[PDB]
Design an enzyme around this catalytic site. Sequence first.
Site, mmCIF file in Angstrom:
data_model
loop_
_atom_site.group_PDB
_atom_site.id
_atom_site.type_symbol
_atom_site.label_atom_id
_atom_site.label_comp_id
_atom_site.label_asym_id
_atom_site.label_seq_id
_atom_site.Cartn_x
_atom_site.Cartn_y
_atom_site.Cartn_z
ATOM 1 N N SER A 64 0.828 -1.436 0.031
ATOM 2 C CA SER A 64 0.074 -0.161 0.075
ATOM 3 C C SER A 64 0.790 1.379 -0.031
ATOM 4 O O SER A 64 1.972 1.187 0.616
ATOM 5 C CB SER A 64 -0.942 -0.062 1.323
ATOM 6 O OG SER A 64 -0.031 -0.056 2.336
ATOM 7 N N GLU B 294 5.469 0.315 -7.031
ATOM 8 C CA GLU B 294 5.771 1.752 -7.677
ATOM 9 C C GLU B 294 4.349 2.102 -8.361
ATOM 10 O O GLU B 294 3.432 2.630 -7.572
ATOM 11 C CB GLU B 294 6.819 1.413 -8.932
ATOM 12 C CG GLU B 294 8.108 1.396 -8.066
ATOM 13 C CD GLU B 294 9.063 2.711 -8.011
ATOM 14 O OE1 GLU B 294 8.744 3.729 -8.623
ATOM 15 O OE2 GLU B 294 9.757 2.806 -7.057
ATOM 16 N N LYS C 277 9.379 5.459 -1.574
ATOM 17 C CA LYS C 277 9.759 4.378 -2.591
ATOM 18 C C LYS C 277 11.129 4.698 -2.878
ATOM 19 O O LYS C 277 11.578 3.693 -3.345
ATOM 20 C CB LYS C 277 8.728 4.910 -3.892
ATOM 21 C CG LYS C 277 7.309 4.346 -3.434
ATOM 22 C CD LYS C 277 6.343 4.540 -4.789
ATOM 23 C CE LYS C 277 4.760 4.363 -4.318
ATOM 24 N NZ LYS C 277 3.778 4.459 -5.569
HETATM 25 N N1 NDP Z 1 -2.995 6.471 -10.012
HETATM 26 C C1 NDP Z 1 -1.980 5.528 -9.566
HETATM 27 O O1 NDP Z 1 -0.966 5.458 -10.310
HETATM 28 C C2 NDP Z 1 -1.972 4.921 -8.260
HETATM 29 C C3 NDP Z 1 -0.906 4.241 -7.558
HETATM 30 N N2 NDP Z 1 -1.133 3.726 -6.418
HETATM 31 C C4 NDP Z 1 0.368 2.926 -5.819
HETATM 32 O O2 NDP Z 1 -0.039 1.349 -6.068
HETATM 33 C C5 NDP Z 1 0.684 0.787 -5.211
HETATM 34 C C6 NDP Z 1 -0.403 -0.064 -4.223
HETATM 35 O O3 NDP Z 1 -1.365 0.662 -3.805
HETATM 36 P P1 NDP Z 1 -2.985 -0.094 -3.515
HETATM 37 O O4 NDP Z 1 -3.307 -0.873 -4.642
HETATM 38 O O5 NDP Z 1 -3.968 1.167 -3.404
HETATM 39 O O6 NDP Z 1 -2.421 -0.549 -2.243
HETATM 40 P P2 NDP Z 1 -3.666 -1.001 -1.223
HETATM 41 O O7 NDP Z 1 -4.141 -0.084 -0.078
HETATM 42 O O8 NDP Z 1 -4.827 -1.803 -1.842
HETATM 43 O O9 NDP Z 1 -2.804 -1.913 -0.032
HETATM 44 C C7 NDP Z 1 -2.159 -3.103 -1.021
HETATM 45 C C8 NDP Z 1 -1.643 -4.312 0.103
HETATM 46 O O10 NDP Z 1 -0.694 -3.570 0.768
HETATM 47 C C9 NDP Z 1 -0.686 -4.723 2.008
HETATM 48 N N3 NDP Z 1 -0.299 -4.033 3.528
HETATM 49 C C10 NDP Z 1 -0.850 -2.877 3.844
HETATM 50 N N4 NDP Z 1 -0.431 -2.767 5.108
HETATM 51 C C11 NDP Z 1 0.529 -3.709 5.370
HETATM 52 C C12 NDP Z 1 1.291 -3.784 6.314
HETATM 53 N N5 NDP Z 1 1.635 -3.096 7.461
HETATM 54 N N6 NDP Z 1 2.218 -5.060 6.276
HETATM 55 C C13 NDP Z 1 2.070 -5.907 5.325
HETATM 56 N N7 NDP Z 1 1.239 -5.757 4.153
HETATM 57 C C14 NDP Z 1 0.489 -4.736 3.999
HETATM 58 C C15 NDP Z 1 -1.826 -5.541 2.107
HETATM 59 O O11 NDP Z 1 -1.534 -6.992 1.514
HETATM 60 P P3 NDP Z 1 -2.403 -8.196 1.596
HETATM 61 O O12 NDP Z 1 -3.145 -8.655 0.552
HETATM 62 O O13 NDP Z 1 -1.274 -9.238 2.060
HETATM 63 O O14 NDP Z 1 -3.284 -7.958 2.929
HETATM 64 C C16 NDP Z 1 -2.751 -4.739 1.125
HETATM 65 O O15 NDP Z 1 -3.511 -5.603 0.292
HETATM 66 C C17 NDP Z 1 1.280 1.688 -4.210
HETATM 67 O O16 NDP Z 1 2.511 1.993 -4.732
HETATM 68 C C18 NDP Z 1 0.436 3.117 -4.521
HETATM 69 O O17 NDP Z 1 1.185 4.413 -4.409
HETATM 70 C C19 NDP Z 1 -2.294 3.370 -5.739
HETATM 71 C C20 NDP Z 1 -3.495 4.278 -6.435
HETATM 72 C C21 NDP Z 1 -3.432 5.196 -7.461
HETATM 73 C C1 GO6 Z 2 -11.161 9.575 -6.235
HETATM 74 O O1 GO6 Z 2 -10.942 10.723 -5.214
HETATM 75 C C2 GO6 Z 2 -9.545 10.834 -4.677
HETATM 76 C C3 GO6 Z 2 -8.415 9.998 -5.370
HETATM 77 C C4 GO6 Z 2 -7.044 10.318 -4.877
HETATM 78 C C5 GO6 Z 2 -5.968 9.603 -5.178
HETATM 79 C C6 GO6 Z 2 -5.303 8.563 -4.147
HETATM 80 C C7 GO6 Z 2 -5.913 7.439 -3.988
HETATM 81 O O2 GO6 Z 2 -5.313 6.595 -3.550
HETATM 82 C C8 GO6 Z 2 -3.854 8.875 -4.439
HETATM 83 C C9 GO6 Z 2 -2.906 9.907 -3.838
HETATM 84 O O3 GO6 Z 2 -3.150 10.179 -2.432
HETATM 85 C C10 GO6 Z 2 -3.567 8.587 -5.857
HETATM 86 C C11 GO6 Z 2 -2.018 8.285 -6.142
HETATM 87 C C12 GO6 Z 2 -0.955 7.818 -5.210
HETATM 88 C C13 GO6 Z 2 -0.058 7.449 -5.362
HETATM 89 C C14 GO6 Z 2 0.517 7.674 -6.692
HETATM 90 O O4 GO6 Z 2 2.079 7.314 -7.095
HETATM 91 C C15 GO6 Z 2 -0.066 8.025 -7.660
HETATM 92 O O5 GO6 Z 2 0.258 8.353 -9.095
HETATM 93 C C16 GO6 Z 2 -0.464 8.730 -10.154
HETATM 94 C C17 GO6 Z 2 -1.426 8.252 -7.439
HETATM 95 C C18 GO6 Z 2 -7.074 11.126 -3.576
HETATM 96 C C19 GO6 Z 2 -8.078 11.799 -3.082
HETATM 97 C C20 GO6 Z 2 -9.401 11.751 -3.544
HETATM 98 O O6 GO6 Z 2 -10.502 12.270 -3.081
#
Ligand code: NDP
Ligand code: GO6
EC number: 1.23.1.1
Lengths: 309, 309
Positions: free
Chosen positions: A82, A114, A136
């Site tokens: 996460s 990432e 990261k």
């Molecule tokens: N727009 C974009 O490009 C986006 C980028 N991201 C990035 O994607 C990546 C994954 O994010 P996202 O899918 O939202 O992650 P999630 O919030 O869904 O969590 C991913 C996993 O992390 C594990 N986790 C959380 N806390 C712990 C802990 N203390 N110890 C061990 N495992 C833990 C859990 O694994 P388990 O399955 O084992 O329980 C959980 O399922 C991140 O790097 C994030 O920054 C995410 C959102 C937007």
């Molecule tokens: C839908 O509405 C919302 C959506 C969000 C986006 C969050 C969701 O996880 C994060 C930023 O905190 C997006 C993000 C995280 C990591 C990254 O490397 C990344 O790259 C593009 C983008 C925030 C607030 C909102 O009210």
Amino acid sequence: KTRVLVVGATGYIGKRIVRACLAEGHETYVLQRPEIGLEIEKVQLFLSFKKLGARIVEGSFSDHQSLVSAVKLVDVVVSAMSGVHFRSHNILVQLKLVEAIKEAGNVKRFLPSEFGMDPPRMGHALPPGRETFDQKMEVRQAIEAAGIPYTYVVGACFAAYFAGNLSQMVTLLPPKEKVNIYGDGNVKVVFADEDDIAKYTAKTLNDPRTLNKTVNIRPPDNVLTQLELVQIWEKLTGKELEKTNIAAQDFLANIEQMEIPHQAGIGHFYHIFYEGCLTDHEVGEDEEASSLYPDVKYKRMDDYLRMFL
Amino acid sequence: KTRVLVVGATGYIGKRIVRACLAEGHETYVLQRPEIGLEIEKVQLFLSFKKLGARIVEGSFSDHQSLVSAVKLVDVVVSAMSGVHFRSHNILVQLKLVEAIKEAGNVKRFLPSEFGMDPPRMGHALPPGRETFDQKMEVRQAIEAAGIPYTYVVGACFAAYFAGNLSQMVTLLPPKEKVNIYGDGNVKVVFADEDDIAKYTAKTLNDPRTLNKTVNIRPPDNVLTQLELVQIWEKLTGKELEKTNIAAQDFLANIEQMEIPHQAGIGHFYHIFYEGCLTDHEVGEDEEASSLYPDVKYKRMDDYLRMFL
Ligand SMILES: NC(=O)C1=CN([C@@H]2O[C@H](COP(=O)(O)OP(=O)(O)OC[C@H]3O[C@@H](n4cnc5c(N)ncnc54)[C@H](OP(=O)(O)O)[C@@H]3O)[C@@H](O)[C@H]2O)C=CC1
Ligand SMILES: COc1cc(C[C@@H](CO)[C@H](CO)Cc2ccc(O)c(OC)c2)ccc1O
Ligand SMILES: NC(=O)C1=CN([C@@H]2O[C@H](COP(=O)(O)OP(=O)(O)OC[C@H]3O[C@@H](n4cnc5c(N)ncnc54)[C@H](OP(=O)(O)O)[C@@H]3O)[C@@H](O)[C@H]2O)C=CC1
Ligand SMILES: COc1cc(C[C@@H](CO)[C@H](CO)Cc2ccc(O)c(OC)c2)ccc1O
């Protein structure tokens, strides 16, 4: 046949990565942590993974040898740990995984969590949002100090969080009548369906061309300004939206008084939509996923928005 | 084609009911509340329901006229409102739905959020676990005081919470080595795969035979003592678990010092496994789901437990 362990297998992108590894033909292992034994949705996700052919590996981040035992089973490790203040921000927990990979010695490639903005380009990012990129980078430092081979998957906004809502961060659904346009709305953003991100990840993790590289997900038809995204929605619905432009100074006003997770998301949003950080630099076809893997017919944002009609 | 509105459509049993209704051929509407617009797993569940043919209906429990407008669209309303202290016990929120159905006037049948122990039979249940049955009875009283036709679906433990864990409350997985046997373990319990519960619900909701009746889900092959359940697991694994019998007074000791949700769960567990409340009375074939709907080939618990191997 490549053996892959997915850590973070029930995560938002992690579960899509698991399914893509299985569809790609990898022998797919998933880490099932004891700490989620009472979370029914996670437990049943692991059961659905088994039914598709995944292999369950038990292990805990507080049990170093269990991590070492898990990564000894595979060729490639993918972490989807996460990394959002709104959900959870545990990027540095992967340091334990890196140590385990260093001790094990057998891992041909590690893909850390990432999947977003390109951390080495975010040196000037706004706090506290910049913590995402600092952490990261710390994980990158540990991988490379250990000599672990790597691939860094970066560069696209997840479509659910930024496209399905016309980039209105107050909801995940398209707006009814009115829309905020950030700045002039003429800054290019990269959008990708998370299932395509997963598929590109499953294809790249044993590609010699991306060993020890950053791979950019920048599919050409999905490089759109926010106004272009909105106009797609207006065309699909046949209805013009009432637009209000938000200047950069007003977007950031009184940020210091908002909750930390909202300050972080505001800061990230600003870099993407006001500074254009996803498009402010060129990348070659040998480091871009849609050129590398042209058999992936990626979902364009008009087809993505069509599911909300 | 019967028109069905599911309220609580992203719930644990609720999502299964949405899918069972679609598979049954009902014209299936689902209430999408604005309050869950930032919950990604709910939003994407609604997208998955749309793809299967469900119709989205927007409304909020804080907007009485939106509820009235929603129930006016359909013949049958099914509620799967939350009702477990460990996951948000909001049974009485349904009173607002009853009031909207009363005003609308067109609803042929309402199924409230029952799906568990038979509330009228629980008048002597232990606090605070009795709150579940007290609140469901208040909902029944309001349905009947409004003249709304009903079906109450009762009588089976959800298999994920009671069978797949061998009825050990601390987990959702079978135990590796040791198992607690509650009392002598010779008290009959009813177990049902929740997909079957959802299919019986989809079949009964327009069945003239169940208008204004209680329908019991008591599949004969799934009426098992806890020992019989454990012995199924032992037969599938080839190995016996070390069993410790827990007397009733030791199960209940110091209940007053537990957190309230755990106190409720202990009390519910007590009625089922020590007092046999799911099997201490008989029901006729015209009020039992497996007889009423013999074409449902319900999953037996040996097949259920196989997915945990
Ligand atoms: N727009 C974009 O490009 C986006 C980028 N991201 C990035 O994607 C990546 C994954 O994010 P996202 O899918 O939202 O992650 P999630 O919030 O869904 O969590 C991913 C996993 O992390 C594990 N986790 C959380 N806390 C712990 C802990 N203390 N110890 C061990 N495992 C833990 C859990 O694994 P388990 O399955 O084992 O329980 C959980 O399922 C991140 O790097 C994030 O920054 C995410 C959102 C937007
Ligand atoms: C839908 O509405 C919302 C959506 C969000 C986006 C969050 C969701 O996880 C994060 C930023 O905190 C997006 C993000 C995280 C990591 C990254 O490397 C990344 O790259 C593009 C983008 C925030 C607030 C909102 O009210
Ligand atoms: N062994 C057995 O027989 C079991 C019986 N049950 C019973 O099943 C029934 C449903 O339980 P379950 O599936 O666990 O429920 P959930 O905890 O999954 O919640 C179901 C739905 O309730 C809605 N909800 C919760 N709070 C509110 C609120 N303030 N306002 C409006 N809607 C709300 C939500 O609807 P939305 O989708 O709109 O967000 C949620 O998805 C209950 O009566 C429960 O007692 C449950 C566990 C075991
Ligand atoms: C059979 O009838 C019912 C059964 C239930 C089950 C509830 C009781 O709180 C909970 C789950 O939601 C069961 C549970 C509690 C604690 C635990 O550690 C546990 O381990 C998996 C499982 C609610 C309502 C009912 O009418």
